[PDB]
Amino acid sequence: TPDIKLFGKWSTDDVQINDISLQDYIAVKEKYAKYLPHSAGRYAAKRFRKAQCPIVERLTNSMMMHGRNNGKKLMTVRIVKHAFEIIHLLTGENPLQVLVNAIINSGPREDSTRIRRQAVDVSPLRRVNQAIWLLCTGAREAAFRNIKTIAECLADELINAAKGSSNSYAIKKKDELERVAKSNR
Amino acid sequence: GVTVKDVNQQEFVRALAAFLKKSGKLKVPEWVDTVKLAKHKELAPYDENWFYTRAASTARHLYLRGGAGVGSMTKIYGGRQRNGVMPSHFSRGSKSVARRVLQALEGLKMVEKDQDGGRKLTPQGQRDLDRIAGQVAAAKK
Amino acid sequence: RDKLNNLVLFDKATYDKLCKEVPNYKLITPAVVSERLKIRGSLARAALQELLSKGLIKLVSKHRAQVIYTRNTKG
Amino acid sequence: IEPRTLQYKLLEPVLLLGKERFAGVDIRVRVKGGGHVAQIYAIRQSISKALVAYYQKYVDEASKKEIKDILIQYDRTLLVADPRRCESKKFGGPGARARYQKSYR
Amino acid sequence: QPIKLARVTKVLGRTGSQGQCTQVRVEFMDDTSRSIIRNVKGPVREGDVLTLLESEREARRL
Amino acid sequence: SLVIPEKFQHILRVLNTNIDGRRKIAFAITAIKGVGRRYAHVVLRKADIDLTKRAGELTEDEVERVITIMQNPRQYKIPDWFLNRQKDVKDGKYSQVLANGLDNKLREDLERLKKIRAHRGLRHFWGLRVRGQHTKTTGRRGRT
RNA sequence: GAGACUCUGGCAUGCUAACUAGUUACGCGACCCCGGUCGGCGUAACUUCUUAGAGGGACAAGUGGCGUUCAGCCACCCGAGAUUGAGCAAUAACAGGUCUGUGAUGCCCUUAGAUGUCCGGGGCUGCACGCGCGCUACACUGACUGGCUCAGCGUGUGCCUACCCUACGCCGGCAGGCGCGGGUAACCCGUUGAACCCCAUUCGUGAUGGGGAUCGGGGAUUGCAAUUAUUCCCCAUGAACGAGGAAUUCCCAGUAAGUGCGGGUCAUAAGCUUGCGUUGAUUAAGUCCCUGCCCUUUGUACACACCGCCCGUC
RNA sequence: UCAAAGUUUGAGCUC
Ligand SMILES: [Mg+2]
Ligand SMILES: [Mg+2]
Ligand SMILES: [Mg+2]
Ligand SMILES: [Mg+2]
Ligand SMILES: [Mg+2]
Ligand SMILES: [Mg+2]
Ligand SMILES: [Mg+2]
Ligand SMILES: [Mg+2]
Ligand SMILES: [Mg+2]
Ligand SMILES: [Mg+2]
């Protein structure tokens, strides 16, 4: 597929970013996509080099945790590969649209700090980073000690996260932080 | 045509084990049933006619690089003696099973002790390598 | 705290239930069938390899660690 | 081509430039040093260089610039080298950076 | 109380234990006219967008 | 295989020893006393067995075949170095020694060490670390 | 003192050059459908590759704001390099440690009816109890079982000194046994025949093949001699541990973290200790809140210095 | 626009 591309079996145009809030700063379109999350690296070198890192890579980065899996990127990549295919299979939406719904719901728009702490709405790099870390910890906890594979559980997790069921640990943290903040803000 | 590098190795070993059984002239050892693949290994090989699978691998390493003696095949064929609580080390294969795999292939004319030492792959061996290469190539094709 | 007491072999009625329902899931992994019907993942793999033998399911990606099969493409 | 898990990494530049440039060539790649992935990400950049050098060297240079610019417009790692290399463990500790474990109690 | 997006026009200053929370002047991209102050945790740059569920709150600058 | 087998034994008996059907045949048979995972594995190589089968699948006759080979290893072609009774105490004839035979042989190991009054018999009674451990630093759950 | 320096990495298809390094031009041979392959063979020069001496090489070189338009910052551009990485490392401490390396050693004491010394043996490993450095875990992103694959650290027969690296064919699961060779080494070890990776099974969410502590019986080797198991080997019992509470170790780039590989020592050969490769992130470009640190000011009844000084009843 | 933060062998510092 050298001249015109069909990325495997995926259309370039016709993938709408629904939420207006994160549209520029999710630099997810027309160029940032690559065949794998995995890439040589250097993505955490400078400040916004992290920003220019692909968001699928940031899912890979979050997935590898609990010791035995540190620096096994191809394996946790394969996880993201088969889970995204699966998300696409079961829900019937473009996996990054379901994921953008993950970024939208799971990103905490504010956090608290010592200015007794007061809440303030956060910058986009941490707020996306936080959403990815959260739903990764959710997928791991759900899939641990179960026959079901991590990649298939990870697909199911992105589905239920975009849905917003309140069953994700990430949503449990978001609801706890928000209501405590209302009481003491 | 095709060669070992051209082949996917997993179904390569299954085709070659069938190929060597079809020949039915390896003279398989008596102890193939009793033996365990390394003092550091726990169970016997998953393939039932495993001695044939390592005869394939050892021959194909001698193709890859000739002159591979017993100790040579064990170094290439070495690995983690996962020592549990103690730290891990490099562990050679078993001698009796390795030496007999090499002696089995020396018997049936697959491998040959070249002058000035070491094995080279014999006319019959390079024949069998590219034929089973074409057979497996046809399978994956 | 939690434990999985899974069944080693299908009953005949369950065999009819498999022949009916399992090819309807979009995800067919031995683990998927294991969580839903409380059955072992290994015999699960053999069951999906059996729907392969009888000729009921198309493979997407099987691999030593993790396999995935499905009912063949729907359309 | 084993490892087959890292093949799309190998085709990214091939897909980027297309088959028309590479069609006239056939290229074997010899590899050494590093490890398997390091060497894989190496031969990735290598063949793309060799082809740019082929058109820059034995034919007219407009082909070299057009190939090279399409490459620059897609991704800079293809040109900016990874200087990254594996850091050695240091004496005075159990790990790489730590100096020896201070132990109260 | 609807949602409001706002662009960082000007980093004012960092407050916080680590000088970690930028009090920032923002222009609303819906109503280009309006603009507000407030502090923010996490890495901030002049010119980036927040989705505030409220624009009425405001952080005490030091 | 998928239909439930006939006379499915949720527990087998061997040497007055119960065998679990959940485990895979090679490791499930090791539930038997006087045979372990490899020695059991050896009897299975000597036997005509597709070890990819499960331990609930195989019949009571198969466990009895493995067991008779285990009990009379000399009679059923098991090596001397593979045995869990190397150089047997009573007669010095290679046969396999079992659970009750095992407990009796245990009584005999204690009788030998105590009667001669050997230090290591003393170390069995005292309960100390023979392997070069500090007992200064071990054995707490038992000792209070 | 930092810096500088010395060494390393990198730019040198340039100088000087090599049968213990290869090279580019061809041809043959067996086979596969002319060629392709081969550490099967032949045709010379040369140093592109290789090896390492001399030299040479990049510097804020370009720009914007800001600034005495100074020093230069930040950002961006420009580039194979716009910090490669070490070694060394100021003044001054602790009354933390070293007479336990030695005929290192001061002072005091001792020396034949000896507190010397020699021979053999012991504790250091002696165990109701506790901690710190460490090791192993709680599994399926994984384990069990085969096959496949690039390295970097390395070594090798010793003055006395017992043990070399090792190619090539046979014997035991393992410890280990029989023929000839190369090498004192770019010649022989050695293409430094690593793991990971990659493929199909098998396992199946289980105190599980997770975890391998403890130990019975036996077979080997290391050693004069191991009971406080010398080590390796063979079969077995199989604690807690279902991902870490208050606590606390570790980290900004090839870093943290996974994973093996080697060395000193070295009879068994890395459990000490110190390296070697291999896969490879997050976050911050911010601040001194915590923790420490560095300066200025400030108060002080401390100055063997808050681990301080200091007050009264009984 | 202020709830709190105690001690430290007798076994030898010093021109
Ligand atoms: Mg290997
Ligand atoms: Mg300096
Ligand atoms: Mg002295
Ligand atoms: Mg003596
Ligand atoms: Mg799982
Ligand atoms: Mg175990
Ligand atoms: Mg056991
Ligand atoms: Mg005053
Ligand atoms: Mg008070
Ligand atoms: Mg005191």
Side-chain angles (χ1 to χ4, degrees), chain F residues 93-112:
Chain F
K93 293 195 168 188
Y94 296 83
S95 180
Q96 190 100 26
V97 189
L98 290 305
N100 263 347
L102 177 51
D103 297 318
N104 300 9
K105 285 305 206 179
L106 175 52
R107 295 293 99 228
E108 290 180 85
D109 273 321
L110 297 170
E111 191 254 327
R112 164 171 84 74

Short mmCIF file of all heavy atoms in Angstrom, two decimals, chain F residues 93-112:
data_model
loop_
_atom_site.label_atom_id
_atom_site.label_comp_id
_atom_site.label_asym_id
_atom_site.label_seq_id
_atom_site.Cartn_x
_atom_site.Cartn_y
_atom_site.Cartn_z
N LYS F 93 17.14 -56.20 47.20
CA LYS F 93 16.58 -56.67 45.95
C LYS F 93 15.75 -55.49 45.47
O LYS F 93 14.98 -54.93 46.25
CB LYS F 93 15.77 -57.97 46.07
CG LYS F 93 16.68 -59.13 46.45
CD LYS F 93 16.11 -60.50 46.27
CE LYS F 93 17.25 -61.49 46.40
NZ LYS F 93 16.87 -62.88 46.07
N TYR F 94 15.89 -55.15 44.20
CA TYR F 94 15.20 -53.97 43.69
C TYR F 94 13.75 -54.26 43.34
O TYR F 94 13.42 -55.08 42.48
CB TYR F 94 15.99 -53.31 42.56
CG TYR F 94 17.27 -52.81 43.15
CD1 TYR F 94 18.36 -53.63 43.32
CD2 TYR F 94 17.35 -51.52 43.62
CE1 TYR F 94 19.49 -53.16 43.91
CE2 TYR F 94 18.46 -51.05 44.20
CZ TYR F 94 19.53 -51.85 44.35
OH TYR F 94 20.62 -51.30 44.94
N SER F 95 12.93 -53.60 44.14
CA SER F 95 11.50 -53.59 44.16
C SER F 95 11.23 -52.21 44.74
O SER F 95 12.15 -51.53 45.21
CB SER F 95 10.91 -54.75 44.97
OG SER F 95 9.50 -54.71 44.98
N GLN F 96 10.00 -51.77 44.66
CA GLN F 96 9.61 -50.48 45.21
C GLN F 96 9.00 -50.59 46.61
O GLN F 96 8.27 -51.54 46.91
CB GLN F 96 8.65 -49.83 44.22
CG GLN F 96 8.24 -48.36 44.40
CD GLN F 96 9.00 -47.40 43.52
OE1 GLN F 96 9.48 -47.76 42.45
NE2 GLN F 96 9.01 -46.14 43.91
N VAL F 97 9.32 -49.61 47.46
CA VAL F 97 8.90 -49.54 48.86
C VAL F 97 7.85 -48.44 48.95
O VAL F 97 8.06 -47.32 48.46
CB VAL F 97 10.09 -49.29 49.81
CG1 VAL F 97 9.71 -49.44 51.22
CG2 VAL F 97 11.11 -50.36 49.60
N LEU F 98 6.73 -48.76 49.60
CA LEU F 98 5.51 -47.96 49.54
C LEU F 98 5.07 -47.42 50.90
O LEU F 98 5.44 -47.94 51.96
CB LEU F 98 4.36 -48.77 48.95
CG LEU F 98 4.45 -49.10 47.46
CD1 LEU F 98 4.62 -47.83 46.70
CD2 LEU F 98 5.56 -50.09 47.17
N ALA F 99 4.24 -46.38 50.81
CA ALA F 99 3.59 -45.71 51.93
C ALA F 99 3.68 -46.45 53.24
O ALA F 99 4.32 -45.95 54.17
CB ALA F 99 2.13 -45.52 51.58
N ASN F 100 3.06 -47.62 53.38
CA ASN F 100 3.19 -48.26 54.68
C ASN F 100 4.61 -48.80 54.80
O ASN F 100 5.24 -48.72 55.86
CB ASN F 100 2.13 -49.35 54.91
CG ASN F 100 0.93 -48.84 55.71
OD1 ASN F 100 0.97 -47.77 56.29
ND2 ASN F 100 -0.14 -49.62 55.72
N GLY F 101 5.14 -49.33 53.68
CA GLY F 101 6.52 -49.77 53.67
C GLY F 101 7.41 -48.59 54.00
O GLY F 101 8.41 -48.73 54.69
N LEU F 102 7.01 -47.42 53.52
CA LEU F 102 7.76 -46.20 53.75
C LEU F 102 7.77 -45.80 55.22
O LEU F 102 8.82 -45.48 55.78
CB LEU F 102 7.15 -45.09 52.89
CG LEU F 102 7.71 -43.70 53.01
CD1 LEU F 102 9.19 -43.81 52.85
CD2 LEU F 102 7.12 -42.85 51.91
N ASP F 103 6.61 -45.82 55.87
CA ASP F 103 6.55 -45.49 57.28
C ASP F 103 7.31 -46.50 58.13
O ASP F 103 7.99 -46.14 59.10
CB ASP F 103 5.09 -45.39 57.71
CG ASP F 103 4.35 -44.28 56.99
OD1 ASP F 103 4.94 -43.19 56.83
OD2 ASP F 103 3.20 -44.50 56.58
N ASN F 104 7.25 -47.77 57.75
CA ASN F 104 8.01 -48.77 58.48
C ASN F 104 9.50 -48.54 58.28
O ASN F 104 10.29 -48.64 59.23
CB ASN F 104 7.58 -50.16 58.04
CG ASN F 104 6.12 -50.41 58.29
OD1 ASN F 104 5.37 -49.49 58.65
ND2 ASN F 104 5.68 -51.64 58.09
N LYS F 105 9.91 -48.24 57.05
CA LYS F 105 11.32 -47.95 56.78
C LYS F 105 11.74 -46.72 57.58
O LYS F 105 12.90 -46.61 58.01
CB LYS F 105 11.52 -47.68 55.27
CG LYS F 105 11.51 -48.86 54.26
CD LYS F 105 12.48 -49.99 54.52
CE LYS F 105 12.79 -50.67 53.17
NZ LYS F 105 13.75 -51.80 53.24
N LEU F 106 10.82 -45.78 57.78
CA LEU F 106 11.06 -44.63 58.63
C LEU F 106 11.36 -45.06 60.05
O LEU F 106 12.33 -44.62 60.67
CB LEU F 106 9.83 -43.74 58.56
CG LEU F 106 9.61 -42.48 59.38
CD1 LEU F 106 10.75 -41.47 59.33
CD2 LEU F 106 8.33 -41.87 58.83
N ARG F 107 10.52 -45.95 60.58
CA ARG F 107 10.75 -46.45 61.93
C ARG F 107 12.14 -47.07 62.00
O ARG F 107 12.87 -46.91 62.98
CB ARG F 107 9.70 -47.50 62.34
CG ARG F 107 8.22 -47.13 62.49
CD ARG F 107 7.89 -46.19 63.63
NE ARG F 107 7.71 -44.76 63.36
CZ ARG F 107 8.28 -43.79 64.05
NH1 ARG F 107 9.09 -44.04 65.07
NH2 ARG F 107 8.03 -42.53 63.74
N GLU F 108 12.52 -47.77 60.93
CA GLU F 108 13.83 -48.42 60.84
C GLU F 108 14.99 -47.42 60.76
O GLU F 108 16.05 -47.68 61.33
CB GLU F 108 13.81 -49.36 59.64
CG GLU F 108 12.91 -50.56 59.86
CD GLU F 108 12.88 -51.51 58.70
OE1 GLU F 108 13.77 -52.37 58.62
OE2 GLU F 108 11.93 -51.41 57.89
N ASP F 109 14.81 -46.26 60.11
CA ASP F 109 15.88 -45.25 60.06
C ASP F 109 16.11 -44.69 61.45
O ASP F 109 17.26 -44.49 61.88
CB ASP F 109 15.54 -44.10 59.11
CG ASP F 109 15.94 -44.38 57.69
OD1 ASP F 109 17.02 -44.97 57.47
OD2 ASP F 109 15.18 -43.98 56.78
N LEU F 110 15.01 -44.50 62.19
CA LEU F 110 15.12 -44.03 63.56
C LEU F 110 15.75 -45.10 64.46
O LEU F 110 16.61 -44.79 65.28
CB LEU F 110 13.72 -43.64 64.05
CG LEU F 110 12.95 -42.50 63.38
CD1 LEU F 110 11.54 -42.44 63.85
CD2 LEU F 110 13.57 -41.18 63.76
N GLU F 111 15.37 -46.37 64.26
CA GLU F 111 15.97 -47.46 65.02
C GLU F 111 17.47 -47.60 64.80
O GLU F 111 18.24 -47.73 65.76
CB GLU F 111 15.29 -48.76 64.60
CG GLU F 111 15.59 -49.96 65.47
CD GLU F 111 16.54 -50.96 64.80
OE1 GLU F 111 16.49 -51.10 63.56
OE2 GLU F 111 17.33 -51.62 65.50
N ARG F 112 17.91 -47.43 63.56
CA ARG F 112 19.33 -47.50 63.26
C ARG F 112 20.12 -46.35 63.88
O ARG F 112 21.07 -46.57 64.65
CB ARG F 112 19.47 -47.55 61.73
CG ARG F 112 20.83 -47.27 61.11
CD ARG F 112 20.84 -47.57 59.59
NE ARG F 112 20.34 -46.50 58.71
CZ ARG F 112 20.99 -45.38 58.42
NH1 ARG F 112 22.19 -45.14 58.93
NH2 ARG F 112 20.44 -44.49 57.60
#
